[PDB]
């Protein structure tokens, strides 16, 4: 995954440049349609955005440096090079809808700010995420 | 000597680890049923006993 | 003093109240009523509790965060009271605006139980029909409701009783004398501030609350127990 | 003028809903992997509709 | 480049069945439980076009009331609620979910994958978007009505001191869920 | 004959998710800094940071970084295939995270005891929104560690459970970093 | 130990051994939902004990008295002796509030446990021949439980309870022709009456509890006699029972579940209020409250009273009040419930003798009818508390009564449709796995490029790998590999370290051996069943 990891440095350099430019400009430049002073929202936003693209670019690069030459990253790969297992995928699950319902109960409790609704929604949410994450591991019944 | 789980694959010790945080030996998620397993098996060795049910008509 | 107070009140009125109540407090046809003759009590209740300014017409204006300080509220109340008087605020013997001293007619440090016992009957006859036993609230016609009596301070309870806000009836001091109002205040604040002896109150709504509690979660946990003890095959 | 043509633009969805509904259950059947003929992308290398796991074979 | 052998007994694989030939009960429990990216994509697209019809109906009420100078059937409040919710529905319940629905359907077909990476997270995304829509539109069921501060929710007009109805909260949690 | 090394898919998904959680906390930090600018425009900010308690904050910082070291020891245990080392270190990490959140709750209780609240000042609003959202993220992290311990209790320890443990370690490292940054802004430079 | 003597006496005097031996070997199936009836039974036991306790401190008289007692915020207030002794239970008796709280919580749990137990009986089909008598007894029991709870909360003579007595009296006067005469019979006069609370008292403590105990005794005797039903499953036929014997397993399980229900009701009794009668004040015909609802098991009746329009008949010098049609509707529902096995016999054409339950997915009409009746009952319950709904979620109260009216039509229809299709979908999902086997979730790429998901057949296979599809047997079909056991833990030991290897290997050996033994037991039993049908 070379090109994917490497193309995250375009926007990283650009957003860092725009961050420093915006910062110096908003603190030093004066025009009649704004008040001079560093604008903190855009400052923090742009530097953290460059942080996000830095994060992905660096992690994906640090992975790329020790993955083998895969057939999907090769220009003349034969279709039989990926023959074998591809991986495990969930065939079905009721718990995504369950989680959406838990989050719905939580959000309506937050709306009305009923304390019992917030408590029950948080309980439902931890339960449904737990049951999602225990789906393919529940024991066989021992009776 | 240190402990290894009985469900853990055996491996070439020069090849590092079965899995680590950056890399795996599979493109998707590893299976809960152990990747060393090969499916299907015989129905006899799943242990499912298919019932025989007759209801009164 | 009072003329500087009336100046401050007029200036605040001119940039916050003048679109719905008019420059001479006469009212604007479908935006707001006339304020001529409402008194300082009406302005105190409405502004201090946060009900004014209304910012959209509906079935009922709601209590929200106040837009003006208490001093600013009293400035506006002075200015409105100059346009034809009305009922005023309850001041204590020293001259401060009365607050915890209204907690029963025989107040002296703590609430006395005779006041609570008479104010309970007064509240259960004149008030609880709309606000439920112990003042948790109730629903009226077409999106209207009687609020929860927790947020109101003692002055606001008194001025609510005097001014009859929105669909609330008026209770003059000839109808419910001063002592009967103070006992109603004592009862509200006793019940609003005494934890139930039998554990969690479940909002004090009445049987629907305990219903929901049991008939969902109570039977759910014992179904969980049954599934723990029994077989799913 | 704007509102008159707005109601026209609102009527525009009536043939669209009817076309979707009718064609979903009585529409002309597709007998080829690529009924437009010149599909560039890989989705036209598989059947209409694809099987559960998309590809019965890859080119 | 390698060449395969002309293998014996070869016949092309079987074609799946088109739509409209479904037996009853074939999609209810499947919809509720599926992690197939492409059924999920069809669900996304149907959902977003239904919301398109809702928001557009709000827009046509707006255009009806702007037809002539006076207020013929709407109030100022109701007109404000209408443009606010037209904007929110069309951007956040039609636009973004139809983007992700088309992506869900065609993207694994375009790159040559069998599934998407995280199937149950895909299912979760669909259902949480639907719940966000339901929450956002639930404000209209109040007596005061929906939110009426424009889809931008400018402040201090969005503060509780200046927009106290419950719909103003519902709008927030709606966009959050989406 | 052997199989090729590929990117761990679940790790990639977790890192993308943690990038967007960093972008969540961006906004709260921006709120803080706008508030701080307005507060230093008349020197009121310093009088509100005169309620802070830097030694105690540094203490719970030490505790949280120790817990992150602990969960990385657990990661090592997992990738070697050892359920018992993992199951030990993750419990130690859960204990340390519980200690963190209880200490932060005590910090709130004492700050409320003498002034600072959401309503009493703009400083209190910024302080409690930022530290409260972070504490909620810490509580979700310890929830994650407990659910991992359940998973490896009642399902055999294959690599599929090891990957889960490793990505929950990634999540705990993210909260540790958010704490170091939040501690550096609201306690040191103030 | 001396037991030789004890048994020798007992048997010698009563010829006892054969009978008790027949009893200790009785088999019970152990599905979890077969516990639900026990919950109601244990609730009833708690109700009797706490009830007798409360009779030692309660004076059911309507005579007025000035209160002087523990609760000082009602000192000097005139109240009936009923309300006064309720207050004295609450504040003068040590632990009295705890016991009254437990009594009321147990009443709620009693009615809801009977409700969900009846739902098991309905959806699983257990009412069918030979078990319609238990259905009839049971609907009588649940109606009597409602009536008992009404008379129970009516006794303390607080304001909220007296409003409910007022309403019941007003229902009874409205009935033609005999409404006024019925009222003067029940109450012994105009309402409120000198004998009102005393008749309610003896109904509540003696008469209805006696009908309830006699009917529970007949019910449980009849379930013991006609042995318990069971689900389809390996080895399970119409002509047997499979489960666990009474001694030691089922009896210990029942005593433990009784402990759990007792302790749960005891915890409720302390950590949450249920009827702060002191906050309501004594009864006054002129006063009322906003959210003055009855208890949850009666909310459906109140909701009926709310949704019925003002359809009143004026026949010259006479009139049939609007609230007549409420009583008609409620009566119809009640009569329909008690006569369900018989209309199902009419419309299914089945009158056979059944001992194997049905899964609710396999019988979609009954499931959909039951669900739409649950939606009907839940909408009547929610309309019976609609003003609390409106106050707390800010809906229009007029919109809420209209939601009640329009929804008692459209809601059950939508519910029937949704339920029917979900039933058939679960049904069809079972056939998918009996045809093609369990989806393992593993996706495997073939050399031609195909992605194929590995299935696991549950039965034999054809020469081309495709399974030979098994027949549906009425039982549950496993849907994931962890159900067959392929995620079971392969290490034995505590939390912080393993067991020694000598124990671990031997233990896993024993475990695998017992699994094979149990499987072969069920397979041999299943083959004996096939053979016994020739
Ligand atoms: C749970 C409820 C339940 O059991 O319902 C099952 C039942 C389906 O019947 P079944 O017995 O389970 O299966 C047999 C069906 O015939 C098998 O399904 P089908 O043959 O009906 O085909 C699926 C269905 C369509 O699928 C569904 O109805 C289910 C998936 C969507 C549901 C979620 C979104 C619904 C809207 C929410 C808005 C708020 O097709 C159609 O209805 C015709 C085509 C779409 C036109 C009709 C919809 C108009 C609005 C959308 C305009 C779209 C413009 C074009 C976009 C491109 C389209 C490719 O009803 C539904 O699924 C209703 C869905 C909710 C409405
Ligand atoms: C309702 C009871 C009733 O009317 O029973 C009539 C029934 C007359 O039937 P039968 O035709 O004489 O029975 C002759 C059998 O061939 C011979 O009896 P079986 O082989 O059918 O089984 C009898 C066995 C069967 O019953 C039991 O083992 C369980 C106890 C009865 C059911 C309890 C729950 C209902 O009950 C007894 O052996 C009763 C012994 C009483 C011991 C009391 C010591 C003092 O009498 C009993 O069942 C005896 C009940 C004695 C216990 C009452 C309480 C004593 C304390
Ligand atoms: C449900 C319980 C369940 O599935 O638990 C799994 C499991 C099943 O037990 P198991 O150990 O596998 O035993 C074997 C079964 O016989 C396995 O037998 P099964 O697989 O046949 O059992 C499942 C059965 C179980 O089904 C039942 O028993 C039905 C009970 C639910 C009542 C209806 C919902 C209430 C909605 C009220 C709304 C107002 O469901 C079905 O067969 C079909 C679906 C039934 C529910 C469909 C949803 C209702 C849609 C209608 C919504 C209304 C819309 C309009 C609203 C009004 C507008 C104004 O139950 C539990 O362990 C759960 C315990 C409770 C937690
Ligand atoms: C674990 C404990 C969690 C469950 C607790 C259930 C009890 C609900 C409760 O607390 O009720 C009181 C509550 C007051 O609100 P509160 O949360 O205290 O917060 C302040 C308000 N902003 O009240 C509320 O917030 C609203 C509660 C009203 C619920 C609906 C009432 C009308 C309809 C009810 C119909 C009857 C019940 C049906 C339920 C069973 C159906 C099978
Ligand atoms: C517990 C589970 C959550 C239940 C619902 C939220 C908790 C209750 C709550 O938020 O109540 C509000 C009340 C103070 O809010 P209030 O001042 O009334 O706001 C409007 C007027 N200013 O709240 C309070 O005064 C109580 C404050 C503590 C609430 C607990 C929050 C849990 C998460 C933080 C834990 C901190 C460490 C311990
Ligand atoms: C679930 C999703 C939402 C998360 C939980 C909701 C918020 C948690 C509790 C809120 C209640 C609260 O803490 O209120 C502030 C509290 C009391 O305030 P007050 O009544 O004014 O007391 C003055 C007396 N000194 O005293 C304090 O200020 C104590 C410090 C409170 C810290 C707040 C922690 C959480 C903040 C971030 C999450 C909230 C997100 C907003 C809700 C949606
Ligand atoms: C129904 C007809 C009512 C009766 C009887 C009483 N009140 Fe009321 N009250 C009612 C409404 C509809 C409102 C809302 C008014 C508004 O403009 O918001 C109120 C308001 C109050 C308040 C204010 C509470 C607050 O939020 O600050 C109080 C303190 C109050 N009412 C008290 C009260 C008392 C003590 C009553 C008996 C004497 C009483 N009200 C009668 C509706 C009704
Ligand atoms: C022998 C059996 C019973 C006796 C002796 C008994 C006794 C009593 C007594 C004396 C009261 C006094 C009022 C009070 O304490 O406030 C009461 C209340 C009550 N009873 Fe019973 N009872 C019995 C059975 C039942 C049953 C079987 C039920 C339900 C089906 C029930 C439901 C109630 C309820 C709900 C109350 C109201 C409790 C309260 O509001 O505090 N009782 N009972
Ligand atoms: C206080 C009331 C009740 C008690 C104590 C009670 C108790 C029991 C018990 C213990 C069982 C056997 C175990 C079980 O199935 O859970 C049972 C079975 C049964 N119950 Fe009830 N029940 C009550 C109410 C009802 C109601 C309301 C109905 C139906 C309307 C009903 C109908 C049945 C039937 C038909 C059976 C036989 C089921 C079978 O054999 O599988 N009972 N009851
Ligand atoms: C000795 C007794 C005998 C012979 C009784 C015979 C049966 C009569 C009726 O059927 C004819 C019966 C089904 C039922 O009436 C629908 C009654 C119980 C009345 C139930 C009832 O209570 C309420 C209640 O308690 C309340 O408390 C605060 C409040 C209520 O509304 C706000 C009600 C209510 O609205 C109804 C209908
Ligand atoms: Ca117009």
UniProtKB/Swiss-Prot annotation, chain A:
The chain crosses the membrane at residues 7-27, 40-60, 86-106, 107-127. One of its GO terms (cellular component) is plasma membrane. It is found in: Cell membrane. It catalyses: 4 Fe(II)-[cytochrome c] + O2 + 8 H(+)(in) = 4 Fe(III)-[cytochrome c] + 2 H2O + 4 H(+)(out). It comes from Corynebacterium glutamicum (strain ATCC 13032 / DSM 20300 / JCM 1318 / BCRC 11384 / CCUG 27702 / LMG 3730 / NBRC 12168 / NCIMB 10025 / NRRL B-2784 / 534). The keyword ATP-binding does not apply. Its EC number is 7.1.1.9. This is Cytochrome c oxidase polypeptide 4.
Curated annotation (Swiss-Prot), chain D:
It comes from Corynebacterium glutamicum (strain ATCC 13032 / DSM 20300 / JCM 1318 / BCRC 11384 / CCUG 27702 / LMG 3730 / NBRC 12168 / NCIMB 10025 / NRRL B-2784 / 534). Cytochrome c oxidase is the component of the respiratory chain that catalyzes the reduction of oxygen to water. Subunits 1-3 form the functional core of the enzyme complex. CO I is the catalytic subunit of the enzyme. Electrons originating in cytochrome c are transferred via the copper A center of subunit 2 and heme A of subunit 1 to the bimetallic center formed by heme A3 and copper B. The gene is ctaD. The chain crosses the membrane at residues 1-21. It is found in: Cell membrane. The lineage of its organism: Bacteria, Bacillati, Actinomycetota, Actinomycetes, Mycobacteriales. It comes from the Bacteria. This is Cytochrome c oxidase subunit 1. Belongs to the heme-copper respiratory oxidase family. Associates with subunits II, III and IV to form cytochrome c oxidase. The 4 subunit cytochrome c oxidase forms a supercomplex with the menaquinol-cytochrome c reductase complex (cytochrome bc1).
Swiss-Prot record, chain F:
It comes from the Bacteria. Keywords: Cell membrane, Membrane, Translocase, Transmembrane, Transmembrane helix. One of its GO terms (cellular component) is plasma membrane. The keyword Cell membrane applies. It catalyses: 4 Fe(II)-[cytochrome c] + O2 + 8 H(+)(in) = 4 Fe(III)-[cytochrome c] + 2 H2O + 4 H(+)(out). It is a multi-pass membrane protein. The chain crosses the membrane at residues 14-34, 57-77, 89-109, 127-147, 169-189. Its EC number is 7.1.1.9. Its main location: membrane. GO terms for biological process: aerobic electron transport chain. Belongs to the cytochrome c oxidase subunit 3 family. PANTHER family: CYTOCHROME BO(3) UBIQUINOL OXIDASE SUBUNIT 3, CYTOCHROME C OXIDASE SUBUNIT III. This is Cytochrome c oxidase subunit 3. It comes from Corynebacterium glutamicum (strain ATCC 13032 / DSM 20300 / JCM 1318 / BCRC 11384 / CCUG 27702 / LMG 3730 / NBRC 12168 / NCIMB 10025 / NRRL B-2784 / 534). The lineage of its organism: Bacteria, Bacillati, Actinomycetota, Actinomycetes, Mycobacteriales.
From Swiss-Prot, chain G:
It comes from Corynebacterium glutamicum (strain ATCC 13032 / DSM 20300 / JCM 1318 / BCRC 11384 / CCUG 27702 / LMG 3730 / NBRC 12168 / NCIMB 10025 / NRRL B-2784 / 534). Disruption phenotype: Cells lacking qcrCAB show strongly impaired growth in glucose minimal medium, which indicates that the bc1-aa3 pathway is the main route of respiration under these conditions. Heme 1 binds at residues 103, 204. It comes from the Bacteria. One of its GO terms (cellular component) is plasma membrane. Heme 2 binds at residues 117, 219. GO terms for biological process: respiratory electron transport chain. The gene is qcrB. Keywords: Cell membrane, Electron transport, Heme, Iron, Membrane, Metal-binding, Respiratory chain, Translocase, Transmembrane, Transmembrane helix, Transport. This is Cytochrome bc1 complex cytochrome b subunit. Cytochrome b subunit of the cytochrome bc1 complex, an essential component of the respiratory electron transport chain required for ATP synthesis. The bc1 complex catalyzes the oxidation of menaquinol and the reduction of cytochrome c in the respiratory chain. The bc1 complex operates through a Q-cycle mechanism that couples electron transfer to generation of the proton gradient that drives ATP synthesis. The keyword Transmembrane helix applies. It is found in: Cell membrane.
